[PDB]
Ligand binder design. Structure first.
Ligand SMILES: Cc1ncc(COP(=O)(O)O)c(/C=N/[C@H]2[C@H](O)[C@@H](O)[C@@H](OP(=O)(O)OP(=O)(O)OC[C@H]3O[C@@H](n4ccc(=O)[nH]c4=O)[C@H](O)[C@@H]3O)O[C@@H]2C)c1O
Ligand SMILES: Cc1ncc(COP(=O)(O)O)c(/C=N/[C@H]2[C@H](O)[C@@H](O)[C@@H](OP(=O)(O)OP(=O)(O)OC[C@H]3O[C@@H](n4ccc(=O)[nH]c4=O)[C@H](O)[C@@H]3O)O[C@@H]2C)c1O
Ligand SMILES: [Cl-]
Ligand SMILES: [Cl-]
Ligand SMILES: [Cl-]
Ligand SMILES: [Cl-]
Ligand code: NA
Lengths: 351, 354
């Protein structure tokens, strides 16, 4: 039964629908530099993911370029290269591009950047990762950054539809980013999205286009903080089509998969720390064993994320050593989930 | 009075060969591998090598866009050498070469041949230079090669707009340590977004793993991200649209762009010159770049036309002079010879009155 597990659901273009969308590009020859699909996808994300009016929805080439475009747009707006802190327990994106010199601190046992490690250092802002659809105690980060006059970015690459105190977690902090990578529940190919305070929208949007704004004619000015960060309308069509056809099923079924693990926890495993009242929509089901173990002991498709960016961060390393990332996708059967739980019970008994 | 020119577009009308694109992407549907180097990437990199004639000494590495080809190239070389390398770029170019890992590159003027003024780096500390082959025109490539050899400097050609201009019998992309090309929709060979790195094999591995955050899955637990890396890879969906467009069009684009250049070469309007170019055969141009003898405004030209490049440093005098004197005329496979002569008619009329 577990032989046919896949990391990602089988995804295939709805060709008739993708062709209908890109017909708009064919009619004007505008397939990028903000063609006719970008507004359609940004709208659909706003309305389907429930983003608030005080937030821009800005699609980009990938989750990484969503984070980098966000920072570059903010840097240009403030006339300074801002210094960010990120947690060790995250993907490389938050220590690359305009963040290549970001400060790396440990997480606390609740899965997010340890606020204790930024008490006595110089920084403009923090990046907190909501791990694989799970969310931190978001209001403790909002409150701290408010009291210290710091920018707050949520790395929601893997966290497009987990609700915190009645709204999409993407609506908290000054900004968040989402990934539409093929491996994300909502993704298809490559893509990213910035959810950000309107204060920064214009500088971020022109910052996808080297800083250039055609509407300014002769005073259009590049920024050395910008790049080519835009989403191509081809990619926007594939992602919008996948979302139109699947987004509601993904939300419901991922929540149901979470329910089975929550009510049938395997022996000596705990759910990854989460602070949502309703079940999170996960990119994988993250469990923590009570002690370090190797993946090669687990006899079905599984992974460990995230190898600490700084291998010296103790909680990050402990989590990495104890974590199991189980496939979570709309192809999973309840039968496969109960078989996985039975295998992990057996794993615990032998280990 | 020129409704015959009302239909001019900057770019040829491009539409997917849906059957060809669907055939290519069926490889992705079979395995669910649409990115992270799916089954189309090797096919597009092979097609570019065989079609553009890239030597076996060079890796062909596709990327998300021409800007990411340049940035992934520099980020991979930075990782291999163990430091953030200092590049000089020319003011008369696109922003890409003063962004990302090049955000602090040194900017210098061009000489009147359209490339980086080598006399301007006399007393600078730098590791390499980036020279822009403007809109398919090439610089005296061997001048730059000899200089970078004598001075032990890395040489990158920004060929964003220059995928098939030959210098001494080989594609200009084959010269220096590396070049990059753009498959942006606005590029003759482009469709949507895309880029390509042509680079000495010495750097191939660091650049390829640098598309994937510096991670190498073949190292297992020793796989290690680099702060010099990013997400720079080309999505196989994009590879399929670009490959299909190249397969159907690249030979016609080379021949037709050469034919269009030939008409301008033999019917130059009064007081305009061809942008400087050092190839023996006609270049393959993203636009026909003419220099008027005097500064002028685009709003005097009664047909679709542009100016490139606004100088990155507006205190670069040769760069500003070119900008003020340049006219970038549409060059694509939809243009009729009849339209080109109506354009030259308009530009003689412009010249006599300015
Ligand atoms: C020397 C050099 N180096 C690097 C790069 C970076 O490559 P990449 O990252 O691929 O853009 C470039 C890129 N040059 C290109 C760039 O790709 C494109 O956006 C464009 O810039 P820009 O003129 O600012 O873009 P635009 O105003 O939106 O479009 C130019 C014309 O192109 C038309 N166009 C534009 C997009 C489209 O989908 N279809 C289309 O027909 C558009 O209607 C307009 O008529 O031209 C540049 C010369 C370069 O020239
Ligand atoms: C916290 C955080 N922040 C930022 C980003 C950056 O977003 P983006 O720039 O979109 O990747 C991310 C991205 N995380 C993702 C990333 O997008 C993806 O490449 C992947 O990384 P990695 O595990 O190194 O890649 P992989 O080894 O190629 O693929 C993981 C699995 O996914 C399967 N896969 C992969 C690609 C595909 O097309 N189809 C497919 O089935 C693949 O077969 C394998 O089983 O997972 C990360 C968790 C993040 O987790
Ligand atoms: Cl809640
Ligand atoms: Cl679908
Ligand atoms: Cl030659
Ligand atoms: Cl075609
Ligand atoms: Na054809």
């Amino acid at each position: 039964g577990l032989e046919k597990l896949t990391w990602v659901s089988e995804k295939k273009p709805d060709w008739s629908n993708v062709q209908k969308l890109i017909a708009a590009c064919e009619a004007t020859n505008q397939y990028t530099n903000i063609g006719p699909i970008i507004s359609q996808l940004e709208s659909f994300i706003r309305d389907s993911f429930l983003i608030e009016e005080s937030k821009a929805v800005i699609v980009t080439s990938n989750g990484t370029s969503a984070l980098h475009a966000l920072v570059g747009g903010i840097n240009r707006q403030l006339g300074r290269e801002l210094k960010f802190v990120t947690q060790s327990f995250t993907f490389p994106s938050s220590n690359q591009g305009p963040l290549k010199d970001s400060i790396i601190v440990d997480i606390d046992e609740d899965g997010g950047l340890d606020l204790n490690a930024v008490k006595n250092i110089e920084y403009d802002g923090i990046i907190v990762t909501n791990i694989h659809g799970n969310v931190v105690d978001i209001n403790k980060y909002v409150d701290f950054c408010m009291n210290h006059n710091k920018l707050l970015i949520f790395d929601n690459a893997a966290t497009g539809y987990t609700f915190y105190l009645g709204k999409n977690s993407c609506n908290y902090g000054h900004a968040s980013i989402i990934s539409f990578h093929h491996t994300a529940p909502f993704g298809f190919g490559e893509g990213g999205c910035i959810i950000v305070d309107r204060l920064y929208e214009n500088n971020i949007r022109i910052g996808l286009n080297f800083g250039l704004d055609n509407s300014l004619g002769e005073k259009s000015q590049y920024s050395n903080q910008a790049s080519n960060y835009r989403m191509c309308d081809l990619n926007a069509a594939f992602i919008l089509s996948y979302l139109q056809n699947n987004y509601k099923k993904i939300i419901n079924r991922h929540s149901e998969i979470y329910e089975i693990y929550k009510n049938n926890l395997p022996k000596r495993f705990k759910l990854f720390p989460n602070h949502s009242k309703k079940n999170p929509v996960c990119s994988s089901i993250c469990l923590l064993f009570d002690k370090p173990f190797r993946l090669d002991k687990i006899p079905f498709l599984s992974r460990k994320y995230y190898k600490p960016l700084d291998l010296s961060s103790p909680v990050s390393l402990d989590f990495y050593q104890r974590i199991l990332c189980i496939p979570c996708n709309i192809d999973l059967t309840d039968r496969q989930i109960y078989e996985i739980i039975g295998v992990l019970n057996e794993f615990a008994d032998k280990n």
